[PDB]
Amino acid sequence: GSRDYKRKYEFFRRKLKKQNDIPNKFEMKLRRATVLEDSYRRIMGVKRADFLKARLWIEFDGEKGLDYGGVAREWFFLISKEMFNPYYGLFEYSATDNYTLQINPNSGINPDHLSYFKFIGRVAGMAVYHGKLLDGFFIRPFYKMMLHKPITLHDMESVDSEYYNSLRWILENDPTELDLRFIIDEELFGQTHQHELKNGGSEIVVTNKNKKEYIYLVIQWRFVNRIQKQMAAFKEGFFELIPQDLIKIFDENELELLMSGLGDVDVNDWREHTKYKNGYSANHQVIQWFWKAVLMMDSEKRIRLLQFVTGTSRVPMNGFAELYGSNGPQSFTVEQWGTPEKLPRAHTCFNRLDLPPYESFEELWDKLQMAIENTQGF
């Protein structure tokens, strides 16, 4: 989004109302170590939700006289780290090796969950109301649900490609051979409940007759069915700040951009938590040139480099120290491989970059750019 985006945004911001009978400020005094629960008590305590529209006046831990907007940007950041922390069971990563967020269908283990989802909805609206960003990115179907858009097979592609092609295959090819039935098995704390999409359950075998409807039910189950109440509570908080009708001028991609921005990467973090292999070290000339290139890359290119190596453009809440791959935790890695006329390669599963020992910075730069730019996500 540029230009078309900027006009939409201006048009959007200019429509946002604030009532006459609202204090000039909304005062919160929080402690960082308990930012989540302190923020929750304060924001869920408010007499009227409209009070959340007044200028944020935030003080952390007794500190007087910090710039208001800087503290507010910090708060949105800290509170995000906490609300979207999977430990609390509200949201979870969409896969072990990705870090896009989705509602945890088992969030109810904390009885209060619905009220926390409303709180998060309000915080997300406050961010959008006040021109700030959350720190965290949701799966596409989450954005489509904010907009009241149906979820489809194609929406699975962006979340689970492996799963997608399988569902894709039994849409084109016959599924009868392999005795498939309308049963889906959920994993929970290493355990396994089994679920049937319709009455009659196990006995029905997936054929060409029932095929499409089968694919439907798998989709609603994976994305929609079991997080209805959680998503209704979030949407209710969010729409106390931002009018539902007005938000619909944005498609799902712009909405994501509205809520969270680009997702700039912390390059110093990244570099601190890189492992090196087959001859390389932090002090190796080629690696020094590598990080010089990354530092000279703009934000979107850094992100594209990261997607190229890891398969995802996102970073986990704890940063590059907590990178996973397909088989558990995996640091970002750079291994010496190939000869200087090769383009770099990537093993996405292991977050590993096979970098040739290029013999000048410029050659490393040109070859890295060509690699990143000529591969595509999706």
Partner: protein, 76 residues
């Protein structure tokens, strides 16, 4: 023994624990390692939330058995 507790990031960690020893002090050993106050912890084994009213013998926890931690929300 050696037990595993998986958090919801995927970060398994590893404790040294006694079969005599109760869940409470297991939380305390987690309290010791990742610094999570025990009162804020939900522990789960074989799909059930472990009651500190009981004992890990009673839950038939076994060597290399795998436990699940999820944090508790405080509420209004």
């Amino acid at each position: 023994m050696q037990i595993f507790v998986k958090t919801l990031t995927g970060k398994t960690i590893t404790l040294e624990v006694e079969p005599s020893d109760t869940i409470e002090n297991v939380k305390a050993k987690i309290q010791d390692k990742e610094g999570i106050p025990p009162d804020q912890q939900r522990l789960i084994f074989a799909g059930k939330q472990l009651e500190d009213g009981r004992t890990l013998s009673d839950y038939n926890i076994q060597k290399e058995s795998t436990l699940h931690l999820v944090l508790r929300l405080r509420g209004g």
